[PDB]
Amino acid sequence: ELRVGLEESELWLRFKELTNEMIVTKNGRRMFPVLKVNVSGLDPNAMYSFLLDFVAADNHRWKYVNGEWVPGGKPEPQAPSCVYIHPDSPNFGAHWMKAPVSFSKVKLTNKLNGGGQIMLNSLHKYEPRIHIVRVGGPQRMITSHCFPETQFIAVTAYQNEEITALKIKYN
């Protein structure tokens, strides 16, 4: 059976207990922590691409009100995010299983951009999700996995100073 695991869940859970925030810029900002995934149960000889997207966890705008994140009352439908292709893609199962798959180069933006960068809505809450796409073979297949531990709110600047502190302490 194909098994997908979060590397450094310990650390992600410290960010999650505070409500995690990720900066978005016009040019795009890399994530900290970086999403790293442990994968086993691939066919070492089969071909795969690793895709990353961000699900809008709810339909609301969030605001940091008197030291606490609170959702607005005017939900809007959220269009799905674009997909980031892991730059090692396409690659053999053996490649993907030999070390954690690290999405260190994805950049989060707030502006429709040349590409590479993934556009998010500021002050929305996101749940990172990967797709493992078996390619080249006759039987195309997709396995998807969400990472609740890695939920964050997209922000143009950190609201919760405890997040600011954690980000520096562990970088």
Ligand SMILES: C1CC(Cc2nc(C3CC3)no2)CCN1
């Ligand atoms: C150029 C190359 C890239 C190749 C590609 N992979 C996929 C699916 C299997 C993951 N679709 O296209 C397309 C975007 N930029």
